[PDB]
Write a protein that binds this ligand. Structure first.
Ligand SMILES: Nc1nc2c(ncn2[C@@H]2O[C@H](COP(=O)(O)OP(=O)(O)OP(=O)(O)O)[C@@H](O)[C@H]2O)c(=O)[nH]1
Ligand SMILES: Nc1nc2c(ncn2[C@@H]2O[C@H](COP(=O)(O)OP(=O)(O)O)[C@@H](O)[C@H]2O)c(=O)[nH]1
Lengths: 298, 1052, 273
């Protein structure tokens, strides 16, 4: 018995929608996406997230033929009861004008059926662009999109399969769909202050998407959340393949001490310390003792 | 009374998976399809009227029958009348076949007929042509096989040979003769047919013929009727059927019904809601019913189902047979029908007409609302009455074809589809009938409907169809009926019973058929299935997983979609499901998921290794059914990575290492079927491609659930059933044996030296048990299980346990002791196994189920009421195998180095007592956690604790005995002993009684000391006495010496 | 004072990216993609593409190997038969036997029979390239049966199943205990070093822009579901010790940590650190 949320994933043929879904929620690798075929019509994805939230993923095939069916015969089935619209653009695309027409046709249908829906726009495949031009091209596409989105508001992200940009995009949508998000954010910030941590990250177990966080000292790399999600997810898969299932981790330096361990049925937690001469058990005892208090909130 | 104890106990290992074999039901030769769709493409209306002049043969009466296609020819003048009759005749045929080339020949020549027929064969190349001949204006056809036409001037009747007529017309054709001696034409047609066959060496079955008359007979001249009587019947049945009704003696029954009211009947022949269309519809039901009941099935599907126009002609021919009969005319057909005129169903027609046109005075004149006929209602009522006591293959219900006609409207569609489901349920024999009568294309057409009320009924009907004939997966995908069911499987408000039928329907539509897999994939099946995978219905969870498994079976597109939706992850939940069907269905799908890799890179390979290791933790599984599919699933993994498993296989003569080690455990399975299938797959690696792929019959066996009946009361609930009476007789016999045994205990246990018998075994007696009620005393050895008796005094049976030469049968139990008893046989190495039909006359040994526990030897404690069984031995663990869930529930740590020599347990107040080899006697409570479990650890011995047994009372007493031979009665709530005794110096084996408190000791020095719990002497019977065994009720004591002998003592 | 290694080969063969992956300046090994150059080099690694024609490759191999022998006769020659390590056995075996055959055939023709050519089957996705590296680097360092034995004494006295002495940057293991080494294990330990270094680069790298991700206090404990414990500890600036053991043995951490100090002191003595 959980909150069911409808998520549309739309964009042109070849834009990289199934590649996103496969990497984030299907334990996929960047290299093995080039073999993904054209998704016929809508291919749904029931993702169980945190037990209180179920994501109804509608991966909509952007073949112009399928696109016209979504605007006509399937208008009510596709655009009704929508919580989030994730729209994907291929940055390397030639048909920029035609892309915007298909985007606007979706927004019209959204305005008419699910006007409440959160809109995210992903300027995807930024890896095909030279590094020094990536920022310029994105800000240029973003300003256009914010304008072209006319009455409705939209959030824009630069995405690439190989890097953590995927986590930048997905985190916001997933973060903004948590039923207890405010409560969750608060409870984790409470736990963090009590445990005396420099940073506490909370991840969904299966996907490794950051669902909540807390920071003390304003950190340098503002893209670390997605990097850590990418790193540990790759490791998780390597663990189950190469030996046995991942259970827990601890990392140290002269500057830090991090602990990754199972938290709830559907989550993982990471606690980072400004590596003081605190023994590993005193940190692990505090983790175990804090479980009993955050559990009450659910 | 001692009956409430019996009825309220779970019978372990007595369900479908155990009793029946795990095998698919063999589909019979389904011969219901129309293996041809012929069509009557064009029609030839040859009319030889010569309106005005009568031919020489028949001089007609002064009033006379004149009407020709409902036209008076003499009214209109000669020439116009002939065109008009031709026009009307065309219209009449166009009611039945509106899309065919009609081509009239009006008072034709011979050349005129030649050019007409030869042209129609050219056009309708290999499809059927109708030739209608109306010879009312020409002389009667001759014996010499001739039919008359005219010369161009209309001055001479020219004969036309039937031979030449069947030359010009082709092979697939149908002939309608409406003339006087019309039988002669049919005789001579068949003669010339045989004559052509003789000439062909150095068009019989193809050619249908209807004829108005027998060769002798003349057509009736009665002024009330048409001249065109036969043609009229075939082509306008309702018109003559009503006119004929008004000419009979039975009109007396309906006053105010003249011929004039019939002319002015309201309605049309299409609109079933009008009065005329009502009758037309009823008539179509009645004729089609008579035909189905009267004709052999072959000839019915030939005539009444092949093509529309033929079927219409023969339906209407049955009316001609009835009507013309009443005028000394017998119509004649080429594919001869048996006589239908006398079918009871005509009495139904009479009543139907009567009631319908008793209303005509009020409908025409008063303007009264036309009440619909109760015909269809009453016929469904008859069909319903048949179903009540119609469980058998007796005479089928006459009304099947009426049930078909009812589906066509909406008025009675709900009720019919209900009854049709109820019928199809009866068995697969019934589904065969329903498909032969031709229900298929109408049931398939209803899947285009939106009326939500139909959804539960059609889902039921289609599950029953597809359970029998799986070929219909072709038809359902073509018409987009696969979408209809997808909607039902994604509907929370639709009941879970009907959603299960829907999941089965999709699993059949999808089964090994790319068109259906590609279609359901696009209709978003994988997403729909995962939403219903965690339902509170074990059948739905099962089928949804099979359905998920079938869709990605040899279909890489459905696998990729499963990876995106992350199905394999959602399916891991089913691997720890209570129900062993569901666990198996889950194992099936995860295996089918693995098998269709087509050699991908990291994404696919990393997933297969995750699915491998998740399956590899269902080795230690209770159900052998799950373990078979677990092998078959890992077979698909071996076939895919054959190069890697050859590396692992050749080494021992770390992923792949683990999966090969799994197959070694499945190779050394207690159960035979699993060991065999594991051995095949393991040997196909050894000698090194796709040939190795085994398929279990699980999904086919599962599918048998929908062939069998559902709606009706089961056999067990029936109070008057023979199974229940013999079960109640066994329970009455049980309560007596408890009472009679209790009476012997109350007298005070006297001396005990009576020997009931002394027999000798092939092997050394290792372990002995007494069957609670029936005198069956199983005395197993190293391998075998001899079943002796102590009333007759005879050898009843001899098994082989199946275990190797190293192994030994340590422990034994009697599962379901009260009724339909089984025999658990725990081997020392770990193997547990269960035997049915162990001391029967007409039956052999039968191993029900068998599963590796663990890994002293092995100890077991059955708990009939709880349903549990707790293996222990050399290991430092006490497993608790639930036999309802066929899984190891709890693994309690012993906290002891030495072997668990004995194990006894308690229901109600859960207390696992476990003696040990070092000397100690632990007690565990299974409610609390594993760290806490140790309730007590008292040590007052030092040896192999032979038996630490617990009593059935709330005042529990742990009677523990060592090799040194000294009893110490403990309590569960105390840290030290209550009573103390010292019995024998060198003890070898011991047994303790449940009801009374006897203790039957053994000795190295051949003694058999039988003392009380208090420590009093009763006997010291002078002869390694390695097995003693008390009854659960009676004070009888078995013994078995080191020498190959048995005894059974008694207190009188 | 680091062991010197040279990568050579033809245009678009396996030099640039090989070096990139091996360097992930803070490594026990001096590594560099390529007559003064062959003067202070201990081992030369020629990379050959096995999924393509190797005829031109074998020609350039003989030229570079003969030239380097003239300069330094004591130098080791290693051949990485690349793009086909953990593949099949029909192709790979044929390719192996042929390259081995032809290379030694060409060597005999120039009278270079005093010249040894070591061959290795390497891969890209797979972490078997580092197995190649392993072999090479073992030869480079003079104290062969000295780290192997020190690890055997440490893991026997403690409750450790497997121990690897890794170069942190490249993730090449310079020694291991005498027990057979499962590939996947090596793989898993390499996968740990990745998460170690990557989490270290993000968090705790001074308040300013950069410091050091790997230092004297770098250490890690990873627990798996099967009770397996992976234990990383710093040995030198470039060398780390990764141990595989069980949770039962890890309960005796005090002894492991005390024995480790003996081990660490000994590794410093060996390399004169
Ligand atoms: N360079 C690059 N390639 C990408 C990226 N994302 C996806 N691709 C590749 O581009 C292709 C995208 O295919 P899909 O993900 O199946 O595309 P889709 O948008 O679902 O397409 P339809 O089902 O036809 O609507 C595959 O080869 C991916 O591997 C990305 O961020 N960068
Ligand atoms: N499949 C595979 N591709 C490789 C491997 N090594 C290099 N490549 C590819 O070969 C191409 C040439 O590699 P590159 O390193 O640029 O060659 P270089 O000129 O020697 O640096 C690139 O597309 C690499 O992805 C390998 O081991 N396996």
């Amino acid at each position: 018995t959980a909150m069911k949320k409808k998520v549309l994933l739309m964009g042109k043929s070849g834009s990289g929608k199934t590649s996103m879904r496969s990497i984030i929620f299907a334990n996929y690798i960047a290299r093995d996406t080039r073999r993904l075929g054209a998704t016929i019509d809508v291919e749904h994805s029931h993702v169980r997230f945190l037990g209180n939230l179920v994501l109804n993923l509608w991966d909509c095939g952007g073949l112009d033929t399928f696109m016209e069916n979504y605007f006509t015969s399937q208008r009510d089935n596709i655009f009704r009861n929508v919580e989030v619209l994730i729209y994907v653009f291929d940055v390397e695309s030639r048909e920029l004008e035609k892309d915007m027409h298909y985007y606007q046709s979706c927004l019209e249908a959204i305005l008419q059926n699910s006007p409440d829906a959160k809109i995210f726009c992903l300027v995807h495949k930024m890896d095909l662009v030279q590094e020094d031009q990536r920022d310029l091209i994105f800000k240029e596409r973003e300003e256009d999109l914010r304008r072209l989105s006319r009455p409705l508001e939209c959030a824009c992200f630069r995405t690439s399969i190989w890097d953590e940009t995927l986590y930048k995009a997905w985190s916001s949508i997933v973060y903004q769909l948590i039923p207890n998000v405010q409560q969750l954010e608060m409870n984790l910030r409470n736990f963090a202050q009590i445990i005396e941590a420099d940073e506490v990250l909370l991840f969904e177990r299966a996907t490794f998407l950051v669902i909540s966080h807390y920071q003390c000292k304003e950190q340098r790399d503002v893209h670390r959340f997605e990097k850590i999600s990418n790193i540990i997810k790759q490791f998780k898969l390597s663990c189950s393949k190469l030996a046995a299932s991942f259970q827990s981790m601890e990392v140290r330096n002269s500057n830090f001490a991090a602990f990754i361990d199972i938290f709830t049925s559907n989550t993982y937690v990471m606690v980072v310390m400004s590596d003081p001469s605190i023994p590993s058990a005193a940190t692990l005892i505090n983790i175990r003792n804090a479980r009993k208090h955050f559990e009450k909130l659910e | 009374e001692a009956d409430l104890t019996d009825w309220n106990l779970p019978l372990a290992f007595m369900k479908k998976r155990h009793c029946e074999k795990i095998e698919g039901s063999k589909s019979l030769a389904q011969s219901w399809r129309m293996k041809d769709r012929m069509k009557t493409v064009s029609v030839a209306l040859v009319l030889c009227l010569n309106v005005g002049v009568d031919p020489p043969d028949v001089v007609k009466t002064t009033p006379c029958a004149r009407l020709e296609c409902w036209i008076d020819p003499l009214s209109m003048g000669p020439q116009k009348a002939l065109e008009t009759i031709g026009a009307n005749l065309q219209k009449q045929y166009e009611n039945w076949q509106p899309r065919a080339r009609y081509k009239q020949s009006l008072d034709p020549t011979v050349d005129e007929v030649k050019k007409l027929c030869t042209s129609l064969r050219r056009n309708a190349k290999e499809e059927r042509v109708l030739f209608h001949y109306n010879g009312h204006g020409v002389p009667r056809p001759t014996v010499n096989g001739e039919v008359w036409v005219f010369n161009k001037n209309y001055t001479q009747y020219i004969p036309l040979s039937i031979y030449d007529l069947q030359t010009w017309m082709g092979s697939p054709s149908i002939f309608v003769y409406d003339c006087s001696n019309a039988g002669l034409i049919v005789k001579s047609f068949k003669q010339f047919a045989l004559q052509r066959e003789q000439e062909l060496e150095v068009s019989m079955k193809n050619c249908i013929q209807l004829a108005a008359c027998e060769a002798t007979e003349l057509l009736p001249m009665i002024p009330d009727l048409p001249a065109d009587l036969f043609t009229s019947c075939l082509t306008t049945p309702i018109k003559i059927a009503l006119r004929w009704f008004c000419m009979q003696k039975c009109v007396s029954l309906v006053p105010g019904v003249t011929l004039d009211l019939i002319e002015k009947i309201p309605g049309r022949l299409n609109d079933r809601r009008t009065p005329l269309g009502e009758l037309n519809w009823i008539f179509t039901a009645i004729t089609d019913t008579i035909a189905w009941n009267v004709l052999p099935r072959d000839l019915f599907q030939k005539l009444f189902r092949q093509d529309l126009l033929v079927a219409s002609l023969f339906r209407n021919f049955l009316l001609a047979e009835r009507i013309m009969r009443s005028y000394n005319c017998t119509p004649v057909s080429s594919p001869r029908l048996p006589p239908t005129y006398m079918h009871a169903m005509w009495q139904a027609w009479d009543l139907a007409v009567d009631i319908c046109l008793s209303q005509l005075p009020t409908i025409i004149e008063e303007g009264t609302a036309f009440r619909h006929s109760p015909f269809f209602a009453e016929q469904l009522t008859a069909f319903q009455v048949w179903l009540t006591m119609g469980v058998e293959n007796r005479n089928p219900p006459e009304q099947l074809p009426i049930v078909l006609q009812v589906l066509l409207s909406q008025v009675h569609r709900l009720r019919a589809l209900d009854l049709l489901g109820r019928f199809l349920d009866l068995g697969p024999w019934a589904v065969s009938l329903a498909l032969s009568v031709g229900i298929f294309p109408y049931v398939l057409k209803l899947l285009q409907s939106s009326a939500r009320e139909l959804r539960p009924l059609l889902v039921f009907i289609w599950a029953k169809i597809l359970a029998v004939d799986s070929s219909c997966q072709a038809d359902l995908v073509k018409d987009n009926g696969h979408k209809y069911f997808l909607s039902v499987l994604a509907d929370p408000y639709m009941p879970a019973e009907h959603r299960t039928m829907t999941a089965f329907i999709l699993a059949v539509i999808v089964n090994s058929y790319h068109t259906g897999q590609e279609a359901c994939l696009q209709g978003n099946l994988i997403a729909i299935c995962l939403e219903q995978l965690n339902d509170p219905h074990p059948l739905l969870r099962q089928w949804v997983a099979i359905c998920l498994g079938r869709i990605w079976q040899n279909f890489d597109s459905a696998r990729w979609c499963g990876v995106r939706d992350s199905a394999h992850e959602k399916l891991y939940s089913l691997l720890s499901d209570p129900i062993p069907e569901v666990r198996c269905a889950a194992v099936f799908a995860l295996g089918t998921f693995v098998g269709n890799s087509a050699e991908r890179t990291d994404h696919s390979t990393t997933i297969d290794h995750n699915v491998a290791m998740m399956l590899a933790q269902l080795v230690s599984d209770g159900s052998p059914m799950v373990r078979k599919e677990l092998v078959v699933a890992l077979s698909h993994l071996v076939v895919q990575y054959e190069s890697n498993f050859c590396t692992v296989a050749l080494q021992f003569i770390s992923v792949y290492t683990q999966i090969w080690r799994v197959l070694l455990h499945l190779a050394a399975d207690p159960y035979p079927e699993v060991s065999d299938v594991a051995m095949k797959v393991l040997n196909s690696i050894a000698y090194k491609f796709i040939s190795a792929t085994v398929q279990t019959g699980f999904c086919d066996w599962s599918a048998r659930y929908f062939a069998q009946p559902v709606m009706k009361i089961p056999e067990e609930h029936d109070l008057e059933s023979q199974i229940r009476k013999e079960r109640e007789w066994r329970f009455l016999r049980n309560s007596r044996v408890r009472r009679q045994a209790q009476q012997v205990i109350q007298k005070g246990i006297t001396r005990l030296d009576d020997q009931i018998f002394l027999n000798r075994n092939p092997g050394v007696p290792s372990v002995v048990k007494f069957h609670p009620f029936t005198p069956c005393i199983a005395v197993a050895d190293k391998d075998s299980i001899c079943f002796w008796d102590w009333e007759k005094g005879e050898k009843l049976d001899y098994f082989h346990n199946g275990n190797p030469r190293y192994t030994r049968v340590t422990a034994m139990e009697y599962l379901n002791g009260q009724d339909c008893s089984l025999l658990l046989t725990a081997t020392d190495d770990g193997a547990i196994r269960v035997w049915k039909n162990f001391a029967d006359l007409e039956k052999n040994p039968e191993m029900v189920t068998a599963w590796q526990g663990l890994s002293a030897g092995m100890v077991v404690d059955w708990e009939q009421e709880t349903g549990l069984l707790m293996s222990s031995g050399d290991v430092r663990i006490v497993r608790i195998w639930d036999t309802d869930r066929e899984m190891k529930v709890q693994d309690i740590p012993t906290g002891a180095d030495s072997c668990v020599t004995s194990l006894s347990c308690d229901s109600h107040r859960s207390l696992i007592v476990a003696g040990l080899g070092d000397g100690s006697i632990r007690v565990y409570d299974r409610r609390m956690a594993l760290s806490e479990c140790r309730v007590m650890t008292y040590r007052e011995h030092t040896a192999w604790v032979v038996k630490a047994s617990l009593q059935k009372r709330p005042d529990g007493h742990i009677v523990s005995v060592s090799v040194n031979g000294d009893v110490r009665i403990f309590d569960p709530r105390m840290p030290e002993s209550v009573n103390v005794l010292q019995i024998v110096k060198g003890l070898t084996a011991l047994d303790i009684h449940p009801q009374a408190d006897l203790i039957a000791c053994g000795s190295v020095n051949q003694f058999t000391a039988i003392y009380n719990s208090s420590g009093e002497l009763i006997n010291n019977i002078k002869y390694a006495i390695s097995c003693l065994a008390f009854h659960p009720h009676w004070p009888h004591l078995a013994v078995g010496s080191n020498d190959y002998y048995i005894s059974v003592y008694s207190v009188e | 004072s680091k062991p010197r290694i040279l990568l050579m080969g033809l245009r678009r063969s396996g030099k640039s990216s090989i070096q990139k992956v091996v360097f992930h300046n803070s490594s026990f090994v001096n590594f560099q993609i390529w007559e003064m150059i062959f003067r202070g080099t201990g081992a030369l690694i020629y990379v050959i593409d096995a999924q393509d024609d190797y005829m031109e490759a074998l020609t350039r191999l003989h030229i570079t190997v003969s030239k380097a022998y003239k300069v330094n006769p004591d130098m080791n020659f290693e051949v990485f038969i690349h793009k086909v390590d953990g593949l099949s056995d029909d192709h790979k075996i044929e390719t192996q036997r042929d390259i081995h055959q032809r290379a030694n055939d060409d060597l005999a023709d120039a009278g270079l029979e005093k010249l040894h050519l070591s061959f290795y089957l390497t891969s890209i996705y797979d972490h078997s390239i580092f197995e190649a590296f392993s072999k090479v680097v073992q030869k480079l360092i003079p104290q062969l049966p000295t780290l192997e034995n020190l690890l055997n004494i440490f893991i026997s006295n403690s409750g450790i199943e497997k121990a690897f002495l890794f170069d942190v940057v490249s993730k090449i293991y310079i020694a291991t205990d005498s027990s057979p080494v499962d590939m996947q294990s090596y793989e898993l330990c390499c996968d740990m070093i990745d998460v170690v270094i990557d989490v270290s680069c993000i968090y705790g790298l001074k308040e300013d822009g950069s410091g050091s991700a790997y230092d004297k206090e770098s250490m890690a404990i990873i627990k798996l579901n099967n009770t397996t414990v992976l234990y990383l500890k710093e040995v030198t600036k470039f060398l780390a010790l990764v141990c595989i053991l069980r949770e039962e043995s890890f309960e005796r951490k005090g002894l492991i940590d005390y024995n480790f100090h003996c081990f660490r002191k000994a590794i410093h003595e060996v390399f004169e650190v």
